[PDB]
Assembly symmetry: C2
């Protein structure tokens, strides 16, 4: 929650140290609303489960790596969160 906001805020300031120009407004809202499809969530969760055993709580970086492999671009916080929620629904250990 506060971790999610830290992440987006961190991204937004790093991306735009001096303000968000109007030319980037559609782009920004679209980015913030961007999400994985169900098929992508399934595929990320499966890939993570195939490669972990529970002794090591799946970290945000682990999810990032799996999602990046699928969408071939840098994942957003929402996309990471979607996969974390899917892993939680099967009781898989998560760092966060």
């Amino acid at each position: 929650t506060t971790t999610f906001m830290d992440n987006v805020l961190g991204w937004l300031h790093k991306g735009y140290p001096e303000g968000v120009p109007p030319k980037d407004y559609f782009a920004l809202l679209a980015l913030l609303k961007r999400s994985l499809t169900e098929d992508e969530v399934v595929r990320a969760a499966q890939a993570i489960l195939r490669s972990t055993d529970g002794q090591s709580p799946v970290t945000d970086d682990d999810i990032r790596n799996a999602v990046h492999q699928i969408i071939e671009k840098e994942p957003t916080a929402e996309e990471i969160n979607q996969v974390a929620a899917r892993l939680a629904s099967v009781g898989w250990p998560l760092a966060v």
Copy 2:
């Protein structure tokens, strides 16, 4: 496409010159804000108490209903949550 055009309009209007880093947290927090399940039920109820099921419910009707409940200016998302709940009982919507 309408939802996005609404929020995009709002952002352009709010910040004609650029979003200053000083407003980032305020903007993101507002964009992320949503009604609780109990708030959505209450807003839908209020509309259903004051409309007949034929006249289309407007964004304004819903905004007013939500404002009464949360006591601050509603966001597009908060309005959409109520519109979706009304649609689930076949209540007509202007948008």
